[PDB]
Paper text:
The bacterial member PspA is part of the phage shock protein (psp) response that maintains structural integrity of membranes under stress conditions such as temperature and infection. The main effector of the Psp system is PspA, a 25 kDa protein consisting of six α-helices connected by short loops and an elongated hairpin, where the N-terminal helix α0 of the protein remains unfolded in the absence of membranes. Interestingly, PspA is related to eukaryotic and archaeal endosomal sorting complexes required for transport (ESCRT)-III proteins and has a similar structure. Here, we show that rods of bacterial ESCRT-III protein PspA internalize and thin membrane tubules by overcoming the required bending energy through progressive membrane binding of the N-terminal helix in the PspA assembly.
Due to the critical role of helix α0 in membrane interaction, we also prepared and refolded an N-terminally truncated PspA including helices α1-5 in the presence of EPL liposomes. For the truncated PspA α1-5 sample, the total diameter distribution was narrower and ranged from 235 to 290 Å, with two maxima at 255 Å and 275 Å that were closer but not identical to the apo distribution of WT PspA. In the PspA α1-5 + EPL sample, we determined a total of five cryo-EM structures with resolutions ranging from 3.8 to 5.4 Å supported by visible side-chain details. For the α1-5 PspA variant, we found only five rod diameters (235, 250, 270, 280, and 290 Å), whereas two different symmetries (C1 and C2) could be identified for the diameter of 270 Å. None of these structures contained any additional lipid density in the rod lumen. Although the PspA mutant lacking helix α0 shows no structural alterations in the helical rod structure, it can no longer tubulate EPL membranes. In support of this analysis, when we abolished the α0–membrane interaction by removing helix α0 lacking this binding energy contribution, we did not observe any membrane internalization in the lumen of the PspA (α1-α5) rods in the cryo-EM images. Interestingly, when the protein was reconstituted in the presence of membranes, the ATPase activity was increased by ~210%, while the activity of PspA α1-5 was not affected in the presence of membranes.
Author numbering:
A (entry chain v): 169 to 217
B (entry chain y), C (entry chain C): 57 to 112
D (entry chain B): 24 to 56
E (entry chain A), F (entry chain w): 113 to 168
Amino acid sequence: ERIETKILELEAERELLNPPPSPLDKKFEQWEEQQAVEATLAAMKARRS
Amino acid sequence: TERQRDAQQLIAQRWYEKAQAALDRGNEQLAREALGQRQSYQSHTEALGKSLGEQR
Amino acid sequence: TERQRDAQQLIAQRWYEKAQAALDRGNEQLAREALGQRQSYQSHTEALGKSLGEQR
Amino acid sequence: APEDLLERLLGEMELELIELRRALAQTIATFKS
Amino acid sequence: ALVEQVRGQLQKLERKYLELKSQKNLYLARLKSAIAAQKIEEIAGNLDNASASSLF
Amino acid sequence: ALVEQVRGQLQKLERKYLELKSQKNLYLARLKSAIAAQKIEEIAGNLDNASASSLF
């Protein structure tokens, strides 16, 4: 318990010193990532067909 | 820096060149995953190319 | 001071350049939120530009 | 000379910022527990 | 009866003791946050406040 | 009865002793991992962080 508490202390600092990207960016990249694969793959299915 | 950019695109190129056969024969699922791996290298490739130009 | 102003507009420019695709395909809601984020950088950009001129 | 105060005051502010910086993690630490 | 009832007191008391300890740090952390934040704005008021800004 | 019961205590106690030893290294390893990872990002924050990057 006392040891594991210190683990959280170090863990809590990383997010503070390295603020996690907001949940905004996650959906945009995921939203964009599907188009990146699909748009690129759209050519894949088109170039071969 | 120039060499690394060329090497990274080749890795994606091999995946892309390989992906041609993976998509071939109708086995789309193999191609689906393969291109997803490529995007990781593509993002790195773009960053270096911008760095090369400004260094000029 | 000049460098910071250029950097901030680029951040908004990437959002604006990205916002072109976000608004694309009819997904307005994504564009709606994106431009709201831009205004925060736009306000900062204007303040610096005024500071640059007076410093001249 | 007020000029030296300007630099010194911010230095004291920086210590408080890190002091507050560390304090926030403590609140986060107990939250996880 | 005495040994049973006395244990119940100890059993109940120990649970309360750790409960207070949990709130001990919570209130201490909040106090420090305000204490640190209390002075910084005071310096800004003594530094930037247009009334008698030592800075400008 | 005394020799039988006392052995049971020893039989049970020994099993617990090694059980704690198994978790001894597990928690020690995790602590070291965070400790090593704690400083490296602090250097990066002191080195790269755009606020007061000593590097750039």
